[PDB]
Design a protein around this motif. Sequence first.
Motif, PDB file in Angstrom:
ATOM      1  N   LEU G 266       0.594  -1.380  -0.189  1.00 24.93           N
ATOM      2  CA  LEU G 266       0.011  -0.041  -0.026  1.00 24.93           C
ATOM      3  C   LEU G 266       0.722   1.540   0.084  1.00 24.93           C
ATOM      4  O   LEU G 266       1.932   1.152   0.401  1.00 24.93           O
ATOM      5  N   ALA G 267       0.336   2.332  -0.473  1.00 23.25           N
ATOM      6  CA  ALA G 267       0.963   3.767  -0.769  1.00 23.25           C
ATOM      7  C   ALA G 267      -0.141   4.695  -0.871  1.00 23.25           C
ATOM      8  O   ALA G 267      -1.205   4.665  -1.019  1.00 23.25           O
ATOM      9  N   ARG G 268       0.520   5.941  -1.140  1.00 21.48           N
ATOM     10  CA  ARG G 268      -0.438   7.070  -1.363  1.00 21.48           C
ATOM     11  C   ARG G 268      -1.151   6.857  -2.576  1.00 21.48           C
ATOM     12  O   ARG G 268      -0.753   6.500  -3.553  1.00 21.48           O
ATOM     13  N   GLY G 269      -2.552   7.277  -2.411  1.00 16.61           N
ATOM     14  CA  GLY G 269      -3.378   7.448  -3.782  1.00 16.61           C
ATOM     15  C   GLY G 269      -3.807   6.191  -4.224  1.00 16.61           C
ATOM     16  O   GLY G 269      -4.064   5.762  -5.218  1.00 16.61           O
ATOM     17  N   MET G 270      -3.851   5.096  -3.072  1.00 17.38           N
ATOM     18  CA  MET G 270      -4.074   3.660  -3.554  1.00 17.38           C
ATOM     19  C   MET G 270      -5.301   3.183  -2.623  1.00 17.38           C
ATOM     20  O   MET G 270      -5.295   3.661  -1.329  1.00 17.38           O
ATOM     21  N   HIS G 271      -6.251   2.720  -3.182  1.00 17.98           N
ATOM     22  CA  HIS G 271      -7.599   2.341  -2.215  1.00 17.98           C
ATOM     23  C   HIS G 271      -7.195   1.086  -1.377  1.00 17.98           C
ATOM     24  O   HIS G 271      -6.425   0.263  -1.856  1.00 17.98           O
ATOM     25  N   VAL G 272      -7.581   1.246  -0.178  1.00 18.67           N
ATOM     26  CA  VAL G 272      -7.556   0.340   0.968  1.00 18.67           C
ATOM     27  C   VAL G 272      -8.131  -0.804   0.386  1.00 18.67           C
ATOM     28  O   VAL G 272      -7.702  -2.171   0.471  1.00 18.67           O
ATOM     29  N   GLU G 273      -9.285  -0.914  -0.257  1.00 19.23           N
ATOM     30  CA  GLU G 273      -9.831  -2.109  -0.830  1.00 19.23           C
ATOM     31  C   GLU G 273      -9.257  -2.449  -2.161  1.00 19.23           C
ATOM     32  O   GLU G 273      -8.599  -1.332  -2.694  1.00 19.23           O
ATOM     33  N   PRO G 279      -6.645   6.408  -8.403  1.00 13.99           N
ATOM     34  CA  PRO G 279      -6.510   7.693  -8.886  1.00 13.99           C
ATOM     35  C   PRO G 279      -5.128   8.150  -9.610  1.00 13.99           C
ATOM     36  O   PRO G 279      -4.611   7.140  -9.999  1.00 13.99           O
TER      37      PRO G 279
ATOM     38  N   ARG I  41       7.944   4.122  -7.324  1.00 19.09           N
ATOM     39  CA  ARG I  41       7.328   4.016  -6.152  1.00 19.09           C
ATOM     40  C   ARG I  41       8.149   3.516  -4.826  1.00 19.09           C
ATOM     41  O   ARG I  41       8.203   4.250  -3.970  1.00 19.09           O
TER      42      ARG I  41
ATOM     43  N   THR J  51     -13.810   7.381  -6.235  1.00 15.11           N
ATOM     44  CA  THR J  51     -12.547   7.239  -6.245  1.00 15.11           C
ATOM     45  C   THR J  51     -11.358   8.397  -6.070  1.00 15.11           C
ATOM     46  O   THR J  51     -10.315   8.367  -6.840  1.00 15.11           O
ATOM     47  N   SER J 153      -2.740   0.936   7.383  1.00 10.72           N
ATOM     48  CA  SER J 153      -2.583   0.670   5.933  1.00 10.72           C
ATOM     49  C   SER J 153      -1.021   0.524   5.443  1.00 10.72           C
ATOM     50  O   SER J 153      -0.980  -0.262   4.730  1.00 10.72           O
ATOM     51  N   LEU J 154      -0.103   1.204   5.981  1.00 17.95           N
ATOM     52  CA  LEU J 154       1.165   1.551   5.479  1.00 17.95           C
ATOM     53  C   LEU J 154       1.921   0.164   6.014  1.00 17.95           C
ATOM     54  O   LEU J 154       1.802  -0.681   6.827  1.00 17.95           O
ATOM     55  N   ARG J 156       2.015  -2.671   4.374  1.00 11.70           N
ATOM     56  CA  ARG J 156       1.175  -3.804   4.466  1.00 11.70           C
ATOM     57  C   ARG J 156       0.782  -4.297   3.057  1.00 11.70           C
ATOM     58  O   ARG J 156       0.684  -3.374   2.212  1.00 11.70           O
ATOM     59  N   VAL J 184      -9.806   5.365   0.679  1.00 17.05           N
ATOM     60  CA  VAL J 184      -8.555   5.481  -0.168  1.00 17.05           C
ATOM     61  C   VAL J 184      -7.620   6.535   0.430  1.00 17.05           C
ATOM     62  O   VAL J 184      -8.036   7.722   1.083  1.00 17.05           O
ATOM     63  N   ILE J 185      -6.437   6.068   0.702  1.00 20.85           N
ATOM     64  CA  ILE J 185      -5.330   7.052   1.391  1.00 20.85           C
ATOM     65  C   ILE J 185      -5.032   8.208   0.475  1.00 20.85           C
ATOM     66  O   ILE J 185      -5.069   8.158  -0.910  1.00 20.85           O
ATOM     67  N   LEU J 190      -1.636  10.986   4.974  1.00 23.70           N
ATOM     68  CA  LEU J 190      -0.227  10.998   5.498  1.00 23.70           C
ATOM     69  C   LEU J 190       0.207  12.198   6.346  1.00 23.70           C
ATOM     70  O   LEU J 190       0.944  12.124   7.247  1.00 23.70           O
TER      71      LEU J 190
END
Lengths: 391, 69, 65, 49, 49, 98, 291, 48, 176, 285, 49
Positions: G266-273, G279, I41, J51, J153-154, J156, J184-185, J190
Amino acid sequence: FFFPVGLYLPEDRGYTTVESKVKLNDTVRNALPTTAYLLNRDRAVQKIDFVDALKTLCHPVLHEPAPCLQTFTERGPPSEPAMQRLLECRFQQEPMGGAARRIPHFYRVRREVPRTVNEMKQDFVVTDFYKVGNITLYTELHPFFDFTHCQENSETVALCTPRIVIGNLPDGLAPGPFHELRTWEIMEHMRLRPPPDYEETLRLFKTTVTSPNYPELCYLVDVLVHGNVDAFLLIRTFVARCIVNMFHTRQLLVFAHSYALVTLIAEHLADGALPPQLLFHYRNLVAVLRLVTRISALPGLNNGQLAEEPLSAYVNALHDHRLWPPFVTHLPRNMEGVQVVADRQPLNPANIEARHHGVSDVPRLGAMDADEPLFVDDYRATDDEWTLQKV
Amino acid sequence: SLLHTFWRLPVAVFFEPHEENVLRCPERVLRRLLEDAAVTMDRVRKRYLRQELRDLGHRVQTYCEDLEG
Amino acid sequence: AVFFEPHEENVLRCPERVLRRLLEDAAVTMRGGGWREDVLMDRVRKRYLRQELRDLGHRVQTYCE
Amino acid sequence: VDRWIRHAAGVERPQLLDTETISMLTFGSMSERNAAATVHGQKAACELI
Amino acid sequence: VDRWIRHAAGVERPQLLDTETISMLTFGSMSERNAAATVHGQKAACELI
Amino acid sequence: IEYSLPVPFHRFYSNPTICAALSDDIKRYVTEFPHYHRHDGGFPLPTAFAHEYHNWLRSPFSRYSATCPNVLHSVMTLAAMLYKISPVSLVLQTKAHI
Amino acid sequence: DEVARTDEWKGAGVSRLREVWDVQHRVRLRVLWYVNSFWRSRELSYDDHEVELYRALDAYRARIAVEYVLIRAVRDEIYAVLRRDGGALPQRFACHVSRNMSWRVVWELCRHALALWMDWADVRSCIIKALTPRLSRGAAAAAQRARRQRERSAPKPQELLFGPRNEPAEQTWYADVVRCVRAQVDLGVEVRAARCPRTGLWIVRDRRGRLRRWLSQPEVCVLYVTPDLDFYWVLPGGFAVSSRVTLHGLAQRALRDRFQNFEAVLARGMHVEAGRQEPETPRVSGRRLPF
Amino acid sequence: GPETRPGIYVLTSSIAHWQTLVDVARGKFARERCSFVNRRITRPRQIP
Amino acid sequence: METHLYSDLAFEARFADDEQLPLHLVLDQEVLSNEEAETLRYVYYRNVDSAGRSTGRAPGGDEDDAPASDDAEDAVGGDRAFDRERRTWQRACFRVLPRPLELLDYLRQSGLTVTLEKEQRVRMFYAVFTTLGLRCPDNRLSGAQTLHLRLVWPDGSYRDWEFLARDLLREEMEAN
Amino acid sequence: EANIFCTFDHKLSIADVGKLTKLVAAVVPIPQRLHLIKHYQLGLHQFVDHTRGYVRLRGLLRNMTLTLMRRVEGNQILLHVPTHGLLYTVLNTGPVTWEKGDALCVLPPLFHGPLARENLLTLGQWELVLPWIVPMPLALEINQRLLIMGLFSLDRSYEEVKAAVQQLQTITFRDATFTIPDPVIDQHLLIDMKTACLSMSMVANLASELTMTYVRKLALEDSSMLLVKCQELLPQHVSPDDEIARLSALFVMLRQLDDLIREQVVFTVCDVSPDNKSATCIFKG
Amino acid sequence: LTPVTMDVNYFKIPNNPRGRASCMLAVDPYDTEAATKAIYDHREADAQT
């Protein structure tokens, strides 16, 4: 309102509907439209040039194809099945060092090549280029780039390559006479619209580098000396004979193909070892070189370097050292980014190239076909002779 | 080297090349293909091992000179 | 001309056993030979021998003065 | 080379753009202010290549 | 040479099999379709040598 | 004639009469395809030299090379067409009213 | 006075700028060495053995040799299947073929195409991109569930009417295209195949239904792999060679360390699901001030 | 500064809400927080 | 600059659990293109030991050297080897500077008191900043170890560069 | 200033006008706080984009000014922002049960259990989605749970975070059911994690020498159920004025750690009808 | 004045002598710094010409 500025008319149909009320001075600044004259709200003239329109031309947004390349790969090959003759490229990359003995191996096969887009584009005239009879019109997607669209390992992919100099613009959008009018304009800018007399020496040069009685010695002595200065003093009286006897029995002039054998005879036979008019022919040739490298530079404006590069190098490829002349004898001084490769890896630093003389290194003579440890002449070519070599 | 077709009688064709792939080529273009396909395509390593051994002999005799110099 | 619509029972012959035998000769001459992975191993070995040769040359140079 | 180009033109500095919350709170940018000489009225002239 | 001349003239292949051949000879056919936009009207021009 | 071999490598300096007199399979190639005898860069280069979108002198240059006469301005046009499209090159040649 | 550690680290400065390479001599990279790092105050040694370097180059030889011994086992399977059928290969691909044409030349062209394909083997090829979806996270469970779903009993009317309802005639293969005459081996390409229902043969297409037309041309040959380890060598005329790609001569951990399929972090701009529309990318570029 | 630097300002923003305003404020005055943690690590007795 | 010192202090931090030592590094345009740098990334590192497998596996051997059996249900013998390959990689820090820059001058715009023995003017076009962590379980470092870079794009593709640890520490290890 | 208007665009059918006048004294947000506006600025349909981010959506919702609908007379609607302190009335839209005394706050609409999903309006493309009025415990727990989705979330993979949000996305409030739509993050997530991480580390640094072992001595000497249930998740100097200053710094760090899940009191009920439709809230908006 | 200046552009029109608009109605009243900016400074082009 909409209005043009800086157009180029068809020169072949140059017509003047008023010969009477106007008669302009015949200089090229009044024979090439670089300005435009509009009116104010009051009845007063105003003068818009390209330099007043500067603030749009030097933007960052006019120098990337990324949204244009993105929307060009969004709609890829042409849906017309009669338009399946222009997307044929075989653009591959292989080791280049062995090509010197593999160049008959390519022509052993007897299969033609499909013509590229850039040769399918230049071959249209200046006023039927805008018709539907032209087939490659969808590729012209920028004034600064080239959006080719052709094959890549059985995948038809778009490819954007920038038109580096304006000579990469096709003549259907910038013709040859427009280029020569630009030459006359820059020639007037450097007080050269009367140029000096060089027509007879270039006439003799034109007839000497086409006549089939060119001697076989010039090639072999060219691949002997390569512009080593002490090599030419050994061949002083021999090239004296080679000039005099040839020119006095055959009107053409020898040594008319090497840069290193025109920049060296005219600079190391000036003692008077020949009849003087032949020295004046060689000095006229190097003066033509000096005149045209005065043209390529913009000498009123080249002061102050920028990003560790001369200002004269940004404006013309003749002074940018990234361009290389097609017959290299010495390696250049400025090697900031030129990754030179023979076969596989870029031979960047001075780890690999080494060569002596007189010691007779028989490993150098034995590994001559072994083209991986190349043998530089250990003379970094300075930037002035690099520019004149490219000329 | 002729093949063994299941269907006995040959079938006419009017299909455009988008619909189906055909082998309509004559013998002469395949002779051209054979001409263009036939012509389009160590001990020295152990010798260099032996020359390295000769260089070992060279350095050990110059080292004998180094001890006796 | 005239053609044949394909099927799964139409086959091609082993071409008179004068190219199949040559193909088995190709198989037996490419069984024992170049194996296409040790070429890059030879490349890195030549790079290693060259860099160690320059290492030994520069070391005996700086210790021979 | 960017500083050289900005010096060669009349624009002074690159300015960042506003985020979502302030653009919801503002109505627009309205960056370039009124010049000291207005003897002709408002102006606009853009172009193509 | 037919394939070259048709591509050098802009006209595509003649799409006329057995099914549509005689029906072109009964009462003609509206063969050339319309254009997507005309601000000038319908066109007409023919030739004599 | 046999101690050397021609190298058509650039879109300049690739002439078919020279490569046909020197070599023989290039002579067989040009006698096979006589339409490839054109001098304005239409001679096919090898696959090592098939980069018509990675050089600095593209096919308009070699097209212009065939039809230009031999006068001095027809020499300096090859220099004048080498002006760069770069933004600093644009403002430099624009300041000189070029 | 109490001076922080980051102050001494900032006022330290790098000792020297080193630069190294890789094994294949392809990528150089520049390495700093700070003086006030804790690497100096560890008091560690350095024992560069020679047989350890020998075994390290042996392990490196194995790591490079994974896919190439796979390709050579592929070629052994080609020759083995060409022998065990006696050379009377079948047709498995739908193509209109003639009879009044000498097939003496096409066999020689197929042998030349095999040799030229073996000249241009690469890490971007058929079997590796066929194995990477198999090497995934849930590919084993999906494979055994497809095995259990392909083997069901007779549909009883009781489960036909009132039970839950039931749920792929298109396959996404991978292909290596060899061009024999012009000598341009095209390395790796996607292709989409189907059973053409007029007969029992295959039809290959691109991503837009383009109906790939190389098989008409006698100048080319192709290799097809499927995600069920199938092997289709195709010469023109629609006749094919069908086999299974072997893996008994390869270590499992070699296949894992070489070309394992990656599962996302996981990273920024990525959906948790997962399995959603994403995006825009971060895209910190040299076009914008970093805002 | 080696002992103390109090810096006072008035602020005029269009953000009425408190949390987003102090978020963008600490995004503008993050160097002050760097100096704050630096003062905490350089003086284990003072309570900033 | 502001990324290397974090993992320096962090490999000083977790020296009790794993015996790791840092290697700060910068990479030029020769490694990868700018479009491969503007969207990149994360970076991964692995320490593959000399005559062994890795340092994320069990110390003496594991069960995953079996033949692959030419099937699909045991194509990897189950997802536990997949979890093992997820375990053997660790994640490093990351920074991207997408401007052309002079490295000595970039450190001189920071407070870094660089003292070079020669003015090696290195001028690349963008600066990625990361720290490989190579380790030694014993306090003695074997010079036949292998370090494995891993650079992954948001698409998912990757180009594993890798190199042995002898040309890396032939000089600075001897400079202690 | 206060009484503002919203000029419409379309012809108005009697069904949509009936739906509008059944939404008298209900909450609608406005971006710009002007005198007269178009219909595009009303509600959240302009502001929503899928989204893109729930956290960005609540961030832009947190800055908007709220308004109450009354006296629609065709083609416009008199909106009225409430002044501070004066008691106004609110008709709720979201199915969140209220209780008398409980302070209320604004939130974006989240996905319902049965998903009634009445758009409240049928126009060309501008529908009318509305922010919900949600009390303090539900709003505080959903902000807490989204920030925990952030901090979990991070570092993982998809699998463990999916198996954790299958539990974590379900939030009840007095036997209701809810789920959070799009966790969504964002860069702002952050930012909030960085501020919370600095805050918790600053809390961790200046802890004293008896606070760090108070639970240890407490679980030693005594015994209770919350004692063991909080223990499962685990003098020399006495100068207590230093502890006064130390806990003052700990208190500003605690309010800074608390005020990353807190959204301020938009309303507080004073009287709610027992059908949970209309109430009298004494605050502005 | 310099012999460079344009008689066809500057001397055919009723104009000020110095080339800068000293009219001061184009600039706003009660603004001294804008007055000195418009009538003297050369970082901004004049609104007259």
